[PDB]
Design a protein around this ligand. Structure first.
Ligand SMILES: Cc1cc(-c2ccnc(Nc3cnn(C)c3)n2)ccc1CNC(=O)N1CC(OC(C)C)C1
Length: 264
């Protein structure tokens, strides 16, 4: 099929790590083109549902999305774009980079462009956070594994009380009522900007998940990272309005980030 990649066209070269579905490896497709290969461990994925949605994910084409090239469905494999510099979260925590804030702003812009595109397709990421962003050889950040949360069978990940749930990237109405929308992706983007300007600090670093959920339920918020200007903090803070309707769109966040870039 159009979505299906012949696994005999793959050459496995390096292990990259382990995620919710198991090992990811680096390799080549037809001897020439770098790819990342997710080897989906048995029982970790609702596979038939994912296969049908891979038809829609293939067509989600934006330069700031980590592209899904295809799937191996005859473990099943997911074949994606390769990002030489790995995960954004680990990238931010490498102090050797000595990032300027203009560089941090450009990572935010990168992610916001991917997400303005997904929102234009009415497609929700559902687990946006720095761990689900990757960095290529030119320092470009792209958004990875968008939509994949729907096919995770692990109950610790899919329940809002589970140990693996993205509590610290979740708006109040997700934590209280499981009400997901474009505005929960907005909430998580603001936490992501906070992670970037915090150089990979855990949000609510001194709190448990349970204490975070009570905190944000009482109206309390993350506060300004040392490297965020007042204008940058205003942008991320706009994402955390208690009323989902009063949060910006990604088109509006993109205009604000572009505005501020004119100041560095
Ligand atoms: C290990 C790994 C590598 C990659 C990957 C892809 C492309 N390029 C590179 N490059 C690179 C260079 N160095 N390193 C170390 C990596 N890496 C992508 C994901 C993962 C693991 N997460 C995972 O699979 N998840 C599915 C998602 O599910 C939730 C959203 C529900 C989280």
């Amino acid at each position: 099929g159009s979505w299906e990649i012949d696994p005999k066209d793959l050459t496995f070269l390096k292990e990259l790590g382990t995620g919710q579905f198991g090992v990811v490896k680096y390799g080549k497709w037809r001897g020439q083109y770098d790819v990342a290969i997710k080897m989906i461990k048995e029982g970790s994925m609702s596979e038939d549902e994912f296969i049908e949605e891979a038809k829609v994910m293939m067509n989600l084409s934006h330069e700031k999305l980590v592209q899904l090239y295809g799937v191996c469905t005859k473990p099943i494999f997911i074949i994606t774009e390769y990002m030489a510099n790995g995960c954004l979260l680990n990238y931010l925590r490498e102090m050797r980079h000595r990032f300027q804030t203009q560089q941090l702003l450009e990572m935010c812009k990168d992610v916001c462009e991917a997400m303005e595109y997904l929102e234009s397709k009415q497609f929700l990421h559902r687990d946006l956070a720095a761990r689900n962003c990757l960095v290529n050889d030119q320092g470009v950040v792209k958004v990875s594994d968008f939509g994949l949360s729907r096919y995770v069978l692990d109950d610790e990940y899919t329940s809002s009380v589970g140990s693996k749930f993205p509590v610290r990237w979740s708006p109040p109405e997700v934590l209280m009522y499981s009400k997901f929308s474009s505005k929960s992706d907005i909430w998580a983007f603001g936490v992501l900007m906070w992670e970037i300007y915090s150089l990979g600090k855990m949000p609510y670093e001194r709190f448990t998940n349970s204490e975070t959920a009570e905190h944000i339920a009482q109206g309390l918020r993350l506060y300004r990272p040392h490297l965020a200007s007042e204008k940058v903090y205003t942008i991320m803070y706009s994402c955390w309005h208690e009323k989902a309707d009063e949060r910006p769109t990604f088109k509006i966040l993109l205009s604000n980030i572009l505005d501020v870039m004119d100041e560095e």
